[PDB]
Ligand binder design. Structure first.
Ligand code: MG
Ligand code: MG
Ligand code: MG
Ligand code: MG
Ligand code: MG
Ligand code: MG
Ligand code: MG
Ligand code: MG
Ligand code: MG
Ligand code: MG
Ligand code: MG
Ligand code: MG
Ligand code: MG
Ligand code: MG
Ligand code: MG
Ligand code: MG
Ligand code: MG
Ligand code: MG
Ligand code: MG
Ligand code: MG
Ligand code: MG
Ligand code: MG
Ligand code: MG
Ligand code: MG
Ligand code: MG
Ligand code: MG
Ligand code: MG
Ligand code: MG
Ligand code: MG
Ligand code: MG
Ligand code: MG
Ligand code: MG
Ligand code: MG
Ligand code: MG
Ligand code: MG
Ligand code: MG
Ligand code: MG
Ligand code: MG
Ligand code: MG
Ligand code: MG
Ligand code: MG
Ligand code: MG
Ligand code: MG
Ligand code: MG
Ligand code: MG
Ligand code: MG
Ligand code: MG
Ligand code: MG
Ligand code: MG
Ligand code: MG
Ligand code: MG
Ligand code: MG
Ligand code: MG
Lengths: 31, 122, 131, 200, 67, 169
RNA sequence: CAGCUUGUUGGUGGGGUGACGGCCUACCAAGGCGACGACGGGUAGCCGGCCUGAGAGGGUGUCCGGCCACACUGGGACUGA
RNA sequence: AGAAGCACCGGCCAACUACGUGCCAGCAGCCGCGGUAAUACGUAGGGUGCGAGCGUUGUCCGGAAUUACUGGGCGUAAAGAGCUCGUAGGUGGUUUGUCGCGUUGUUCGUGAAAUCUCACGGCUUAACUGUGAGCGUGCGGGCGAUACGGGCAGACUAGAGU
RNA sequence: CUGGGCAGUAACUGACGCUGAGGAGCGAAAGCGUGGGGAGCGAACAGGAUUAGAUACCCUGGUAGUCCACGCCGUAAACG
RNA sequence: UCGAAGGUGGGAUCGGCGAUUGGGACGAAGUCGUAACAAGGUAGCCGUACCGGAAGGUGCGGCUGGAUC
């Protein structure tokens, strides 16, 4: 079940990218 | 590995996290013991536990366990707190010593009678 | 590239001894000849000698085996390394297998093993343990 | 501090008759207590601990004192168990036991504690003193005409005398030929388990 | 720098725990009563009394000149 | 008068349609106490039956252990499947010093004086396999001398030389 | 923490010191340190030792002893060897 | 005759039965115990380990070969940079002669005293002290050596390149 | 137009080698900039269907993109 | 002249708090789905891009840590 180790990383990276896309503007570009 | 690698960058031990905090090298430390209440343990071991929010003399705030049965602690009892972490509860990492300034020894204690605080007999 | 022909030689020894080779051939250097001399008079190999190679000198050594097929060398290990040189005084010489094996010691008196180094009174470089 | 308690109890617990002669022992050879007869778990640590308790309570030696003796026995060259037995024998209450000037250990010890003993004419009252070579094991001059000290005469034949000490006639004075080594040491106990113990 | 010379010393010493031989250098100052010296100049030196803030050495003899 | 000692009793299980089928494995070491030691794994549905099977197949897995009078000839390091056990001969005073799984095997082999250290896996069975491998690696001065062609005195150190005859006089 | 250094690097003539010395000064040249960690930030009195460990190591520097620094905080001279 | 208490008893870990409680009180370091028969909570009895000490905390080392010099690893367990070139650095084939820096031998000096180890001596033994011998691993000077490493002056073609 | 590799001769040099912290270059696809191009495919999008819903899978279309030039990006299960 | 302290100033740097806001972890017998594990019901993952309440979907290239002949 080595793919599980990839899925956890995938979900964490996906949520981080989703947060960055939620804030690619003065929400975060100012900061 | 490739001893030159060791001399360029030596072996450095992993950071040993401080097991106990809020006491700063103090085996015991006293607190004003605000907010005594009762909380529940984790998914197994369903019970009710006596804990206290202690303002320690390090100017910090921690959660401590009240060992034994019964206590006269309400809001401002000058308690002495030492280490010891209970397994059931998440935020409990300290224990008030029973038998201190304003923590009486547990009553009706005839076994082990040094923990939980107790004179022998009269 | 080709570093430390001492370890190359003793690794050739290991590989052929593990493969039950009657004899090994390698390049010749004076240090290899003296190491083979030590191995002989300490009794770990049978005769060694030299060819007329196309270039340089060629060192062939014969590996001795018991009456049946048992290794006359139980192993060996390079100890002085081009990446880490190890030196030992006469008073603190290495003890190989508590004494049942020997260590080639390089000293101002030439190459000579643990017994000669101890009872002659000088220590120094410790090339390898044969045992 | 001293144990000051029952002896056959611990003889039963250690499963070995430590003292010389006991009818209270051999009637109930099992260890005492309400669970006195249960099958004990024969663990390595268990027999090591019972064995060290044997070694202690045989001579009436306390824990950290036995420690100190063992840490100098280990440091002494050669082996350690033989010299540990040597020195725990060299304790003078054991010396009196070997000389036969006592019936049991707890009064061999008290004859020293209560100041009935000079060694080189020197008043000693600590029972932990170690006898050296060629030394004299003597008594106070005024001890004569006292009940145990005179029953000590006719009771000198039932117990064999070791060859490392010499006892003489009307002057009840012992001469220590040498510090006894291994053999003449009475052996109610196998002694390598002390050696193994303290490497834990 | 005007009658001053800089000799780059050399030293090898056993590494305290890994046991290797480390090659460590220096850069130190020595005197020249005559300001003639190229680049290279394997030369020898001995200590003196300080002649400047970081002057502690003196050139004694120059051998195998800069070629 | 011939020593057995069981180190680990472990309840294995096999899964079937109905449920779990249980079994016992009984790693035992049999030894004379002087030079003869054997290791048996042993498996059976019952704990004493596994004990017995282990004893019976350990007594047919024998090998001589070369000693010199309570300690081993020279220091070794046995490497099991994943167990690593290091053995260093000890001075004639300090007794056996070993971990739980090794201690039984060397006590049954009958050594009185040894330094043993488990560095690899902590599984008892692989620890005893590593220790057995180390005892195979053990060699005798009198056959190393035949191996090398030189006599006893110029292959074996004078310490163990003079320490041999002190046993048999 | 990657650029730090201008009395900084050196020399000359002086001054000054118990004494060499940019220790200070006039002039002249533009050098010195650094990836083997300069400069910086944080922490810290150091040591024979002490604790632990099989050792190597790890922790620590308390009694004793040696060295240093300081004396409410900061700056300076005097006498006197 | 005036003089014993402390801790613990499921496994580590040496040490067990009963009664009271019934997911409650509570215990616990760990994994776990207690929901009506608790060797694991409270009490009693017994027992074990100690003992003028016994336990709790905190700190550190050990176990931890879990920062690995001694003494570890990187296909799938954490771990080969996406690849290459190349700077510093590390490392380097065969052979001749020399230097003797590393290395190594010996001596001298230093490495205070105290501390630690060995042997005695005395405080009634001990702790403690004293004396003699090691330790003081390191460093500086002189006198040796050149096998290996290093510098230098060369040589060879086997590596490398044309 | 141009790079590398392999073999053979032994003509030549005579250790000039290996690796390489940093560093530099190259680096699928997607993506970005400017300018072209755009058949087919095809993120997005829209409709249809399916479905409890269907922001999907299937269908019908279909924009960016995919292609080219020149830069940028410097990442991949860039894997043996 | 130099000079501590003090004053003025602009920076550097280390912290605290901060309406509001973002994710993380742990919790409970909550709500919406069912994305992965079997061909997990559209093989799964990697990078990247876009889209979507949410898991996710899709495009392009890649891998087998999937299949087929
Ligand atoms: Mg599997
Ligand atoms: Mg001048
Ligand atoms: Mg392995
Ligand atoms: Mg392990
Ligand atoms: Mg000026
Ligand atoms: Mg001047
Ligand atoms: Mg002047
Ligand atoms: Mg401070
Ligand atoms: Mg260790
Ligand atoms: Mg001090
Ligand atoms: Mg103080
Ligand atoms: Mg004050
Ligand atoms: Mg004056
Ligand atoms: Mg137990
Ligand atoms: Mg009940
Ligand atoms: Mg209890
Ligand atoms: Mg603790
Ligand atoms: Mg460690
Ligand atoms: Mg720990
Ligand atoms: Mg590992
Ligand atoms: Mg590798
Ligand atoms: Mg991996
Ligand atoms: Mg790769
Ligand atoms: Mg290359
Ligand atoms: Mg390269
Ligand atoms: Mg280079
Ligand atoms: Mg070089
Ligand atoms: Mg070379
Ligand atoms: Mg004396
Ligand atoms: Mg004495
Ligand atoms: Mg002393
Ligand atoms: Mg000293
Ligand atoms: Mg060629
Ligand atoms: Mg030529
Ligand atoms: Mg790089
Ligand atoms: Mg590029
Ligand atoms: Mg593209
Ligand atoms: Mg474009
Ligand atoms: Mg766009
Ligand atoms: Mg365009
Ligand atoms: Mg479509
Ligand atoms: Mg649609
Ligand atoms: Mg083109
Ligand atoms: Mg990557
Ligand atoms: Mg590829
Ligand atoms: Mg806020
Ligand atoms: Mg699904
Ligand atoms: Mg999917
Ligand atoms: Mg579906
Ligand atoms: Mg699917
Ligand atoms: Mg994708
Ligand atoms: Mg879509
Ligand atoms: Mg695809």
């Amino acid at each position: 079940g080595s793919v599980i180790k990839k899925r956890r990383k995938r979900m964490s990276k996906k949520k981080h990218r989703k947060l960055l896309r939620r804030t690619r503007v003065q929400r975060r570009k100012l900061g | 590995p490739t001893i030159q690698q060791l001399v360029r960058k030596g072996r450095r031990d992993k950071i040993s996290k401080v097991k106990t905090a809020a006491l700063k090298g103090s085996p015991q430390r006293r607190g004003v013991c605000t907010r005594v209440y009762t909380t529940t343990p984790k998914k197994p071991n369903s019970a009710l536990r006596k804990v206290a929010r202690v303002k320690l003399t390090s100017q910090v705030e921690v959660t401590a366990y009240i060992p034994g049965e019964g206590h006269n602690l309400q809001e401002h009892s000058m308690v002495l707190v030492r280490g010891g972490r209970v397994k059931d509860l998440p935020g409990v990492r300290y224990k008030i010593i029973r038998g201190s300034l304003d923590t009486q020894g547990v009553k009706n204690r005839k076994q082990a009678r040094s923990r939980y605080g107790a004179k022998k007999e009269k | 590239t080709m570093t430390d022909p001492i370890a190359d030689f003793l690794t050739r020894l290991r590989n052929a001894n593990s493969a039950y080779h009657d004899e090994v051939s390698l390049p010749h250097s004076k240090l290899k000849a003296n190491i083979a001399q030590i191995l002989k008079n300490e009794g770990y190999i049978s005769d060694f000698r030299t060819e007329d190679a196309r270039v340089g000198k060629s060192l062939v050594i014969q590996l001795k085996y018991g009456p049946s097929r048992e290794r006359s060398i139980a192993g060996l290990r390079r100890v002085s390394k081009p990446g880490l040189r190890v030196y030992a005084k006469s008073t603190n010489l290495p003890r190989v297998l508590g004494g049942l094996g020997v260590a080639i010691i390089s000293t101002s008196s030439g190459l000579l093993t643990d017994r000669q180094a101890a009872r002659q009174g000088v220590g120094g470089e410790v090339l390898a343990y044969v045992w | 501090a001293r144990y000051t308690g029952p002896v056959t109890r611990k003889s039963r617990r250690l499963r070995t008759d430590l003292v010389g002669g006991d009818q209270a022992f051999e009637k109930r050879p099992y260890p005492p207590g309400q669970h006195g007869r249960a099958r004990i778990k024969e663990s390595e640590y268990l027999l090591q601990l019972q064995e060290k308790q044997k070694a202690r309570f045989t001579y009436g030696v306390m824990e950290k004192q036995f420690r100190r003796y063992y840490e100098e026995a280990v440091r002494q060259p050669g082996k350690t168990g033989e010299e540990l037995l040597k020195i725990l024998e060299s304790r003078l209450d054991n010396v009196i036991y070997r000389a036969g000037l006592a019936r049991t250990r707890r009064m061999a010890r008290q004859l020293v504690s209560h100041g009935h003993f000079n060694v080189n004419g020197v008043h000693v009252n600590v029972p932990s003193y170690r006898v050296s070579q060629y030394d004299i094991v003597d008594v106070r001059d005024k001890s004569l005409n006292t009940v145990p000290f005179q029953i000590a005469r006719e009771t000198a034949g039932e117990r064999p005398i070791p060859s490392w000490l010499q006892v003489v006639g009307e002057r009840q004075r012992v001469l220590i030929h040498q510090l006894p080594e291994r053999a003449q040491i009475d052996v109610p106990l196998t002694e390598q388990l002390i050696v193994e113990y303290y490497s834990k | 720098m005007q009658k001053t010379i800089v000799v780059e010393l050399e030293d090898r010493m056993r590494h305290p725990l890994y046991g290797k031989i480390i090659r460590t250098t220096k850069k130190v100052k020595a005197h020249d009563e005559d300001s003639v010296a190229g680049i290279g100049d394997r030369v020898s030196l001995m200590e003196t009394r300080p002649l400047s803030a970081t002057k502690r050495w003196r050139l004694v003899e120059i051998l195998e000149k800069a070629k | 008068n011939y020593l057995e000692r069981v180190v680990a009793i472990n309840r294995v299980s096999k899964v079937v349609k109905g449920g779990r089928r249980f079994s016992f494995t009984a790693l035992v070491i049999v030894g004379d106490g002087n030079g003869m030691v054997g290791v048996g794994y042993g498996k059976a549905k019952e704990v004493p039956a596994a004990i017995a099977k282990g004893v019976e197949e350990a007594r047919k897995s024998f090998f001589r252990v070369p000693l010199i009078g309570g300690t081993i000839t020279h220091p070794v390091q046995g490497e099991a499947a994943a167990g690593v056990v290091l053995l260093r001969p000890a001075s004639p005073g300090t007794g056996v010093i070993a971990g739980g799984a090794a201690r039984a095997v060397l006590e049954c082999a009958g050594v009185h004086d040894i330094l043993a250290k488990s560095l690899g896996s902590d599984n008892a069975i692989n620890v005893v396999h590593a220790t057995v491998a180390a005892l195979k690696l053990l060699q005798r001065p009198e056959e190393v001398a035949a191996r090398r062609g030189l006599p006893i005195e110029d292959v074996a150190p004078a310490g163990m030389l003079k320490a041999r005859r002190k046993s048999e006089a």
